């Protein structure tokens, strides 16, 4: 694990190049001049629940855009068919890997947010919350099926495995 | 300027060319949510939020700026406290707790009036830790002091 971490650091140090000069970039300053967006101040856990329910609503809209009735997405982001499929229904269920990749990213985000929701209800201790957040970022590959969707993501897991050992 | 939280709470609670284009930037909102996760010594954290008129998307709109020696010192304090806690005390949390068929929990009815528990803090003896005693566990420490930080 020492040799692999030092290998990735040598690769990041060797492939370093200065970024290209450009005009300075501000997305939300362009969003603010649009009258369709407003601003407020909220708590972190409230917006963390709003983000995951909005992601559920977005994936549900992307399912029900193509008039699909035989698929079901759980609130914890698991997609399952309701019946045994046919030839044409599998042709009408051809989404990209980006769909399931964003699905697993929202699944990871919902795990991370609900770990705090379980804490602020008084159920677990902060000493146990710090363990729980440490298990998630170490075991993304075991808690999610996101490794099947991007293969280069195998680099990201083993590094989190290697930092798992040393510490 | 800003807007009170009850409006956007009602927006998210009760709820198409204008609606469809706003969902393009959803993993950007995921990134802005994940880079601002609160530290183990904080209990709550208030962040600004941009939101659509119909509740399409919600961003966090803040970069997590810390002072580096304060940050390393706070994590070393957490390191010592967690070593002390494991040599003293263990139930790992049961993963995903909320089941597949139930919706995510409403904030306004279940967390909004419930006071949180105690965080992870070191003791900080008032004789030796006197230069750091008044600001060591704030969100952005010394933000409103003109002598140490340049401004807001």
């Amino acid at each position: 694990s020492y040799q692999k971490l030092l290998k990735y650091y040598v690769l990041n140090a060797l492939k370093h190049r200065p970024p290209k000069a450009q005009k300075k970039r501000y997305l939300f300053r362009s969003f603010k001049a649009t009258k369709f967006f407003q601003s407020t101040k909220l708590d972190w856990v409230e917006v963390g629940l709003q983000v995951c329910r909005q992601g559920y609503n977005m994936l549900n809209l992307l399912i029900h855009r193509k008039n699909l009735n035989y698929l079901h997405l759980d609130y914890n982001f698991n997609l399952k068919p309701v019946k045994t499929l046919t030839t044409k229904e599998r042709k009408k269920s051809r989404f990209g890997n980006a769909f399931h990749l964003c699905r697993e990213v929202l699944r990871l985000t919902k795990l991370v947010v609900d770990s705090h929701v379980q804490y602020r209800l008084g159920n677990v201790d902060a000493f146990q919350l710090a363990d729980g957040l440490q298990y998630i970022f170490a075991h993304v590959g075991q808690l999610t099926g996101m490794y099947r969707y991007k293969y280069k993501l195998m680099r990201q897991i083993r590094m989190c495995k290697d930092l798992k050992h040393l510490i | 300027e800003d807007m009170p939280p009850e409006h956007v709470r009602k927006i998210i609670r009760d709820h198409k060319r204008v609606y469809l284009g706003a969902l393009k930037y959803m993993p950007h909102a995921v990134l802005k949510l994940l880079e601002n996760m609160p530290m183990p010594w904080e209990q709550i954290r208030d962040v600004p939020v941009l939101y659509h008129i119909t509740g399409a998307i919600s961003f966090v709109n803040e970069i997590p700026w810390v002072i580096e020696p304060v940050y390393i010192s706070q994590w070393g304090s957490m390191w010592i406290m967690m070593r002390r806690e494991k040599r003293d005390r263990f139930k790992r949390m049961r993963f995903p707790p909320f089941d597949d068929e139930e919706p995510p929990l409403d904030y306004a009815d279940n967390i909004l009036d419930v006071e949180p528990l105690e965080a992870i803090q070191l003791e900080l003896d008032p004789e030796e830790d006197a230069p750091v005693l008044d600001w060591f566990y704030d969100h952005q420490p010394l933000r409103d002091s003109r002598k140490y930080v340049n401004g807001s």
């Binding site: 450009q22 005009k23 970039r25 997305l27 362009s30 969003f31 649009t34 369709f36 | 060319r17 204008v18 284009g21």
Partner: peptide
């Protein structure tokens, strides 16, 4: 019609960051 023009103007503003260099 106006809302798509607003999103197209914001996309053209995003493309303005590299507009004279890319084309």
């Amino acid at each position: 019609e106006e809302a798509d023009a607003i999103y197209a103007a914001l996309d053209k503003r995003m493309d303005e960051r590299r507009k004279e260099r890319r084309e």
